[PDB]
Amino acid sequence: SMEQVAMELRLTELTRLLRSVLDQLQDKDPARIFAQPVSLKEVPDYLDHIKHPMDFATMRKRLEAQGYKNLHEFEEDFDLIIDNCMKYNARDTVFYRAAVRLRDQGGVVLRQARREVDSIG
Numbered sequence: 001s002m003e004q005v006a007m008e009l010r011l012t013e014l015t016r017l018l019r020s021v022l023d024q025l026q027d028k029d030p031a032r033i034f035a036q037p038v039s040l041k042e043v044p045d046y047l048d049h050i051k052h053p054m055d056f057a058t059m060r061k062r063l064e065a066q067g068y069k070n071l072h073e074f075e076e077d078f079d080l081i082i083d084n085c086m087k088y089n090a091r092d093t094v095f096y097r098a099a100v101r102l103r104d105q106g107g108v109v110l111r112q113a114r115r116e117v118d119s120i121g
Contacts, residue, residue: 010121015066017120018074021113022063025078026056028105033098034081038088049088054080071117075110 029035037055038046046053059077068074085099 011066011069013120014068014070014117015063017113017116018063018068018071021074021109022056022059024109025102025106028102028109029056029098031098033095034085034102046088050084052080053084056081071114078106078110 035056054077082099082103085095089095
């Protein structure tokens with residue numbers, strides 16, 4: 001149908017907007033602390049602590065399969081990245097502190113993305 005195509009055009013433009021958001025969020029992690037999944041070889045107990053691991057490469061695979069239906073779903077993933085880190089790592093660690101900074105800096109990007117998604121439909 002013609003509707004299914006128009007739908008797919010919007011999903012595709014949402015994907016396009018989310019890719020730009022993702023790149024902007026990821027620039028706020030220049031240390032690449034959140035770039036890849038936590039290694040289960042190097043942190044073998046991790047899944048006893050953290051039930052839903054997340055990271056930027058994993059978000060990017062979902063993104064490119066058009067797996068995000070709306071901004072809310074994408075934000076849930078970003079928030080997992082931060083929240084997981086803030087639980088597993090203690091307050092005085094470079095990792096916790098990197099998550100605080102990514103949260104604070106991404107807030108601005110996410111604020112605008114929500115306006116752009118509402119605005120453009």
